[PDB]
Structures are given as structure tokens and as C-alpha cells.
Coordinates of C-alpha atoms in Angstrom, one line a residue:
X282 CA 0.0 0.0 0.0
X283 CA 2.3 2.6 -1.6
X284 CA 0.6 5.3 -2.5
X285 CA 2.4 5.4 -6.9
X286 CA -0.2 5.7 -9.3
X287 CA 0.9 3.1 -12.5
X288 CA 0.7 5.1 -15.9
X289 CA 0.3 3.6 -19.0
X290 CA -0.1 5.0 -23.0
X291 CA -4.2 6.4 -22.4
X292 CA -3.8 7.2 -18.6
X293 CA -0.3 9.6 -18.3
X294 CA -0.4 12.7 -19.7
X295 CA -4.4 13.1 -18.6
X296 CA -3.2 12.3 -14.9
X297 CA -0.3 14.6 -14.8
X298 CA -2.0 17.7 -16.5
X299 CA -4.4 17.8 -12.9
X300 CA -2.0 17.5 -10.5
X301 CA 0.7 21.1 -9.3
X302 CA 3.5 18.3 -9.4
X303 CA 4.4 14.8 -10.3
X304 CA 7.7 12.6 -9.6
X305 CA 7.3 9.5 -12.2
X306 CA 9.8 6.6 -12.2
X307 CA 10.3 5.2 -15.4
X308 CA 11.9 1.5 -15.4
X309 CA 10.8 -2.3 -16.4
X310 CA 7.4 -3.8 -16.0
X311 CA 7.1 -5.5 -12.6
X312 CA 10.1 -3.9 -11.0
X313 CA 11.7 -4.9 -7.9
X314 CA 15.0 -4.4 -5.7
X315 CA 16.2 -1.6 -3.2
X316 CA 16.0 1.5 -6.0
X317 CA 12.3 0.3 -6.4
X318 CA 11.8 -0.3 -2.3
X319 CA 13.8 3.5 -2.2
X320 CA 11.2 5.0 -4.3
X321 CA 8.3 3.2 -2.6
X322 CA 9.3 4.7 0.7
X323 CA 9.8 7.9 -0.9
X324 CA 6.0 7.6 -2.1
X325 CA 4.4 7.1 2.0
X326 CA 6.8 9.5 3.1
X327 CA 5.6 12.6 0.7
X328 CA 1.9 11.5 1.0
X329 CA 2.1 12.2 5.0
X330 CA 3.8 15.6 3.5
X331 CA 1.5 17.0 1.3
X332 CA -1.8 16.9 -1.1
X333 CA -0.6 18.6 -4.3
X334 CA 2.2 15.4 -5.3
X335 CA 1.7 12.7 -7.7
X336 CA 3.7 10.0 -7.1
X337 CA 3.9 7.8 -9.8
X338 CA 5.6 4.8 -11.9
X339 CA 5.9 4.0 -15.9
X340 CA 6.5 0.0 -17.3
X341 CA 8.4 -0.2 -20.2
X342 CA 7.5 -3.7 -22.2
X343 CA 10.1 -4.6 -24.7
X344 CA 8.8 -8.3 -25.8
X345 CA 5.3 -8.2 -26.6
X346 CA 2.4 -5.6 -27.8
X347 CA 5.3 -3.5 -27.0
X348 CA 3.2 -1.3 -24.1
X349 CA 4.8 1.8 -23.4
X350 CA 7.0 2.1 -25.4
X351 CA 6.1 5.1 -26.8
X352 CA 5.7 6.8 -23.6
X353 CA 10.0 5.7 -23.0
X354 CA 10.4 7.3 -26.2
X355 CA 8.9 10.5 -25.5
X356 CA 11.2 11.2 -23.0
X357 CA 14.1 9.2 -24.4
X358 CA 14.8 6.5 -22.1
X359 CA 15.4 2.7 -22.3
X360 CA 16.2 -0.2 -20.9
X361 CA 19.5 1.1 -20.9
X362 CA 18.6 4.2 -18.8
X363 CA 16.1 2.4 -16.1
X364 CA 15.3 3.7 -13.6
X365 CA 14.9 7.2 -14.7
X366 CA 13.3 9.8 -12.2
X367 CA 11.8 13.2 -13.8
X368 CA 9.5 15.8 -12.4
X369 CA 6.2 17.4 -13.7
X370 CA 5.1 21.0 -13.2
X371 CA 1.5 20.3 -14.5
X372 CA 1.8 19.2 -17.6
X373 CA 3.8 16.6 -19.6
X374 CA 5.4 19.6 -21.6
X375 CA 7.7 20.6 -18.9
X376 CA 10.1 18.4 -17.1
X377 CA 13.5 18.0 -15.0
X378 CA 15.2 15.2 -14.9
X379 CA 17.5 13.9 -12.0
X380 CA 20.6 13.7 -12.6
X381 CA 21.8 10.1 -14.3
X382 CA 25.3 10.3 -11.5
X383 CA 22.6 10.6 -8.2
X384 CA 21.7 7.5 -6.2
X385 CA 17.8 6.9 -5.7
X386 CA 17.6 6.6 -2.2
X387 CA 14.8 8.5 -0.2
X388 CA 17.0 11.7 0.9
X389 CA 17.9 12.2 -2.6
X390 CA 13.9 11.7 -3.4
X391 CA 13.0 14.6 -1.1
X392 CA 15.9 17.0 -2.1
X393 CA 15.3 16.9 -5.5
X394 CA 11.6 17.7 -5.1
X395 CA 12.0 21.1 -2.9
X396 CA 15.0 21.8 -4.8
X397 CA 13.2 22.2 -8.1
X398 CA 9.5 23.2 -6.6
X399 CA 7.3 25.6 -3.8
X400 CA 6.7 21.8 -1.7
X401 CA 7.9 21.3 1.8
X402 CA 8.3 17.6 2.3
X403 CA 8.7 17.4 6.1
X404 CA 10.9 15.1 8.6
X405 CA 9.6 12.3 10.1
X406 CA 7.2 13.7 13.0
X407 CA 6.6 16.8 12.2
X408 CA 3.1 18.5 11.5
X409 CA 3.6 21.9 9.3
X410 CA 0.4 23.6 10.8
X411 CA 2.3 23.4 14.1
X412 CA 5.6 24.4 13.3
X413 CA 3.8 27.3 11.5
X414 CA 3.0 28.5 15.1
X415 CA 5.6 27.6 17.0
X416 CA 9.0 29.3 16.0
X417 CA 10.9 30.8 19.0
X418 CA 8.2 29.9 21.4
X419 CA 11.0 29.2 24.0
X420 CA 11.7 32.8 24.3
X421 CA 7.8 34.5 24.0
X422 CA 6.7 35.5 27.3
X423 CA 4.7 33.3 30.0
X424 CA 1.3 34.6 28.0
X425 CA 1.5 33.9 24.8
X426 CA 2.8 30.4 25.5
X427 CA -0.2 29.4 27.5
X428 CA -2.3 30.8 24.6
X429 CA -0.6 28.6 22.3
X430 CA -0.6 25.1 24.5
X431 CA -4.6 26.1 24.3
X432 CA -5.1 26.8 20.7
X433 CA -2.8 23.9 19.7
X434 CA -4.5 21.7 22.2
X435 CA -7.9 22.8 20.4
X436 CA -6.5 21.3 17.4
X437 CA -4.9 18.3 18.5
X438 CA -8.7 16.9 19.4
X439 CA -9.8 17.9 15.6
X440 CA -6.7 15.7 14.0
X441 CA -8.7 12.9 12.1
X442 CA -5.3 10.9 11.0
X443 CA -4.1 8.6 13.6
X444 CA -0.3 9.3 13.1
X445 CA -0.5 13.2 13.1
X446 CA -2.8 12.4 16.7
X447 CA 0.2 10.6 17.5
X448 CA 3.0 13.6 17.0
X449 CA 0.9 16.3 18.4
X450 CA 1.2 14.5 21.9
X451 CA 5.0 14.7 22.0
X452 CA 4.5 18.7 20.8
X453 CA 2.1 19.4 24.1
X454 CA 4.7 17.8 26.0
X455 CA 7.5 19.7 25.5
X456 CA 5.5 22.7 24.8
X457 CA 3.9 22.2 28.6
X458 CA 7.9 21.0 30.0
X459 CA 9.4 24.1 28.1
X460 CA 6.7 26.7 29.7
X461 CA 7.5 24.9 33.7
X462 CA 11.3 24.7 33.6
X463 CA 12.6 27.0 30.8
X464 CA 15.5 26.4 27.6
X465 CA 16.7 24.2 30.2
X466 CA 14.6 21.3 29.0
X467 CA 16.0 21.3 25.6
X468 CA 19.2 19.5 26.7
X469 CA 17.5 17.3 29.1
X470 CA 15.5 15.7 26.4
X471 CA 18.4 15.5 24.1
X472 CA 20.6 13.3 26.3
X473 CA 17.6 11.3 27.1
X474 CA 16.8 10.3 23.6
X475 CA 20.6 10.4 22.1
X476 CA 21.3 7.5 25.6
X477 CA 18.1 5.5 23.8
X478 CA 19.9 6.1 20.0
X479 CA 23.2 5.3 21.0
X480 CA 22.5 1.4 22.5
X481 CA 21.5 -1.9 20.9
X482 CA 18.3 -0.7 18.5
X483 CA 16.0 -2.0 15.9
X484 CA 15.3 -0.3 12.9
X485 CA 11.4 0.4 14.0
X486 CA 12.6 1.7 17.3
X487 CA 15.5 4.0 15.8
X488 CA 13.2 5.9 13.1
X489 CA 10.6 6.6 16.2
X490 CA 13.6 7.5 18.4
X491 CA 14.0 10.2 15.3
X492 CA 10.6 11.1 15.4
X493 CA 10.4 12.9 18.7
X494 CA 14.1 14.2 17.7
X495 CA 12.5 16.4 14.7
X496 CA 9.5 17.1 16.8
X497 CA 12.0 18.8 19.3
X498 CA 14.7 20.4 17.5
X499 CA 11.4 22.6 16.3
X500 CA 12.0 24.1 19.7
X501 CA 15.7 25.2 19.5
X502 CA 16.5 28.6 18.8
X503 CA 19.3 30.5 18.3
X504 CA 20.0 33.0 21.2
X505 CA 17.8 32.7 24.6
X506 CA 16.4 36.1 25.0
X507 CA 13.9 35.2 28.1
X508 CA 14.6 35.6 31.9
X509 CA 14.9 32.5 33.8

């Protein structure tokens, strides 16, 4: 359950034209191995990012009816090329393509797309209607921080997607220990969770170890200009 829309001869340029951006990778029919797995993670990861993406993938058939083919052609790839990555900006007319020497991996995925676009594609954790709000918040005054645990509090109970209702609880937290104790907390919390990082971890508990590591560093800032 990935999320990339297969395109074929009658259904790509249609789909593209109705979408503000489209990634499409371009390789064999019924592909497979880590580029593939790469791009697939690439895929779950921009659809918890944003609404205006089309993620999407193009078969080339050699042997056979020859099925698109044609499409390959267009854009003046082969077997020889696969995979090839290129990005839409609404219509099939205009393209970039990455680069043939960069590694499809899903860091490279994401770069690419806000290098070459207006699209955010957040860390792992974050929620951008939060961050929105919350820049500097460790130095505002006492006031406006209460104001903000209750407004963002507000919207935590409207959250109707079970892994943003999961991040917005770590946010309260350290909004709620940052307002009690002060910049102070900041480097509590990061020796906690780099003690937990550091020791004998599996790959499911490292990535949500990173998690409430991007949720947090939304709190740093870059003097402390608050008493206390």
C-alpha cells in the first residue's frame, strides 16, 4: 500500500495535467529491488507531507504488444537508462530530470523535489500547521505560551489521521515542560533520547527514536532572550 499511481499509454499525460506536481519513475514492467523499495518509501513518506504530489511509476514492455514504449520514447529513455526519475510541473510539456550520476535513495527523493519546486516535504514527526505557530516559542513571554498550548491543544482533538494524533502528543509535552522549567529542558531531552539512539536498537525503534528528535529540534532557537 504505496501510494504510486501506474501510468500507461491512455492514462499519463491526462493524470499529470491535474496535479501542481508529479515525480514519475520510469523502469521495467514489474520492478523490484532496493532502487524500487527506495522510491516506494519515498511515495508514504511525501503523501504524510502534502496533497498537491503525484507519485507515480511508468513499465516499459520490450517483448510483446510493446506497451509503453512510446511513452519511453517520449522522454528518451530505455532499458539502458532504467530507472529514470523526472519531475512534472503540471503538464507533460515541462520536465526535470535527475541527474543520471545521483543515487535513488529516499533523501535524494526529497531533495530533489524542494529543490526544483514551492513543496515542503517534512521530517519524520513533524506536522507543518504546528511548526507554522511555533517558532521561538521558548523565548515569547509566559502569556502567549499558554495561549498557544490552548489553541494547539484545540486542534490536536480535531486531528482525524491517527499518526498526526500521534505527534501532536510529543508537541504538548514539550510545549507544557518548556513553559515549567525554561530552555533548560532542551538539553534534558536530548541526552535522554541520544542515551536510547546510542545502545542496541532496531530499525522500527530507531526511526521513532528520530521522530520525537525532529518534533523537538522545532523548539531550539538561536540565542535565549527570556529571563529564567
Amino acid at each position: 500500500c504505496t501510494g504510486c499511481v501506474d501510468l500507461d499509454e491512455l492514462s499519463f499525460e491526462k493524470t499529470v495535467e491535474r496535479f501542481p506536481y508529479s515525480v514519475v519513475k520510469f523502469d521495467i514492467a514489474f520492478p523490484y529491488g532496493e532502487k524500487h523499495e527506495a522510491f516506494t518509501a519515498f511515495s508514504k513518506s511525501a503523501h504524510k507531507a502534502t496533497k498537491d504530489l503525484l507519485i507515480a511509476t511508468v513499465g516499459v514492455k520490450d517483448y510483446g504488444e510493446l506497451e509503453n514504449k512510446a511513452l519511453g520514447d517520449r522522454y528518451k529513455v530505455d532499458d539502458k537508462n532504467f530507472p529514470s526519475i523526472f519531475l512534472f510541473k503540471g503538464n507533460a510539456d515541462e520536465y526535470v530530470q535527475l541527474p543520471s550520476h545521483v543515487d535513488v535513495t529516499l533523501d535524494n527523493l526529497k531533495a530533489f523535489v524542494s529543490a526544483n519546486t514551492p513543496l515542503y516535504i517534512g521530517r519524520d514527526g513533524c506536522i507543518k500547521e504546528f511548526n507554522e505557530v511555533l517558532k521561538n516559542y521558548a523565548n515569547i513571554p509566559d502569556a502567549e505560551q499558554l495561549k498557544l498550548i490552548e489553541k494547539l491543544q484545540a486542534k490536536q482533538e480535531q486531528l482525524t489521521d491517527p499518526e498526526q494524533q500521534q505527534n501532536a502528543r510529543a508537541y504538548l509535552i514539550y510545549m507544557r515542560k518548556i513553559h515549567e522549567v525554561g530552555y533548560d529542558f532542551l538539553e534534558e531531552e536530548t541526552k535522554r533520547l541520544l542515551r536510547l539512539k546510542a545502545g542496541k536498537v532496531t530499525e522500527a525503534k530507531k526511526e521513532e527514536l528520530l521522530r520525537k528528535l525532529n518534533i523537538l529540534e522545532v523548539f531550539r532557537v538561536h540565542k535565549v532572550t527570556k529571563t529564567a
